[PDB]
Amino acid sequence: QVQLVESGAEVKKPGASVKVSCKASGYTFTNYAIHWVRQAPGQRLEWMGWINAGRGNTKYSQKFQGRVTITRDTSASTAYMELSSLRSEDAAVYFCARDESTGDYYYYMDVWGKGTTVTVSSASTKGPSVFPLAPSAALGCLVKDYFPEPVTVSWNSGALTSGVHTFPAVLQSSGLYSLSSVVTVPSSSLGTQTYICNVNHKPSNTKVDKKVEP
Amino acid sequence: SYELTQPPSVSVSPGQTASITCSGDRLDDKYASWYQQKAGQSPVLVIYQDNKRPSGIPERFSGSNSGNTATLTISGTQAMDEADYYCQAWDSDTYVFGTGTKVTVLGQPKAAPSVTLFPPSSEELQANKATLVCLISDFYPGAVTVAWKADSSPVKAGVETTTPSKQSNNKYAASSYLSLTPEQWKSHKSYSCQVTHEGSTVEKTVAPTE
Numbered sequence: 085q086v087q088l089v090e091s092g093a094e095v096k097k098p099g100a101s102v103k104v105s106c107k108a109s110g111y112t113f114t115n116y117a118i119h120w121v122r123q124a125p126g127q128r129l130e131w132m133g134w135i136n137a138g139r140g141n142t143k144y145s146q147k148f149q150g151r152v153t154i155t156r157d158t159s160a161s162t163a164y165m166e167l168s169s170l171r172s173e174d175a176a177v178y179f180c181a182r183d184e185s186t187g188d189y190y191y192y193m194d195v196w197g198k199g200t201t202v203t204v205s206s207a208s209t210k211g212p213s214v215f216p217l218a219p220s221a222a223l224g225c226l227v228k229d230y231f232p233e234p235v236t237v238s239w240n241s242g243a244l245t246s247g248v249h250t251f252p253a254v255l256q257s258s259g260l261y262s263l264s265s266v267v268t269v270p271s272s273s274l275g276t277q278t279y280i281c282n283v284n285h286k287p288s289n290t291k292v293d294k295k296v297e298p
Numbered sequence: 299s300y301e302l303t304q305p306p307s308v309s310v311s312p313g314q315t316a317s318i319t320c321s322g323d324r325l326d327d328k329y330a331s332w333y334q335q336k337a338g339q340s341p342v343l344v345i346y347q348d349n350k351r352p353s354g355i356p357e358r359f360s361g362s363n364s365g366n367t368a369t370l371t372i373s374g375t376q377a378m379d380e381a382d383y384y385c386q387a388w389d390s391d392t393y394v395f396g397t398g399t400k401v402t403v404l405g406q407p408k409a410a411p412s413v414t415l416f417p418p419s420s421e422e423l424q425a426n427k428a429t430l431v432c433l434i435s436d437f438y439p440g441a442v443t444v445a446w447k448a449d450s451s452p453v454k455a456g457v458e459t460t461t462p463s464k465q466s467n468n469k470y471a472a473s474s475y476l477s478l479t480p481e482q483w484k485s486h487k488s489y490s491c492q493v494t495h496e497g498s499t500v501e502k503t504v505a506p507t508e
Contacts, residue, residue: 216421
């Protein structure tokens, strides 16, 4: 079917530039325009511009002050968006979407991509400190002060899955992330069942196994 | 530039009819489209050219454009229709999305939050740090507000709180952290995490002397 696939998540410093691609499949790339739309955390969708994949002409939102360049590669079925002089307001999810035609008739988008995230921050890679949240039942792990996203948390090397809720991370004023994982367990199990949370932060190559005791 | 203004929120029970409006200048001369965006998903086109429906979109979505107001009507709303809804139109070579409307469908009965407050671990305190962790679980609807108290005064520094997220039973959980120094933690009689859900406040309290 018609599908749009954006490239992977990016982590950038303020002032840098980022190039996101959108790979199109399931239709004739050359007959449609591709839109770029962004969404900052918790905010409205924001149109950035479009390119007619056939002719190559473009239209840009004037809000971006000529910081946006949209291009396409017809043999690759790929549209590109380059955002230069990144600043923290550019940290957002970036969607590509296909126009109903070439951006000049009914003015609606019929197919959307999955979106990709661009993080913009002056923070440097930092591994987390992992602390136990001892029971007294609910117990858990606090994964504190890391950058960038993400960390993954399993329990007992993945053996324990029911009653586990790993929260989305918070971004603190310091620029560093923090999250926690919790398990609700039966009070009987404490002191006989072993509970170990496994924290992996691939950008810093941090692996920590923490046993959570009463 | 051109602006498309939407009400920020609509709350509805399953079966009721939701109406989302979108106002814009000369909207009557424009084609309006509507996109549905469920939590953590890409937008989906539900209405285009004011009132047309794409294939696969439920027929309970309908649209109208009259008197410079586009209106998205969801008849007999279902729980799965909970989403953000965006209006979209075109003006001066610019595609414009509306401000967006959060549509809440009260699908479950009201459930008050369970609150669990963890003090700083001794391991954290030995690393010269201290974080209180407040877990808020099993509540519905998904909206909650967190307030921290040190003794009885409101805490306005060091607080971060996650946006609620569904558990595996379709109730919501939330998380809140109060970052302190160990000296600040150890020099107060008590700290409390106060969770307000539908006008009713749940509280938990911890102390350095426990």
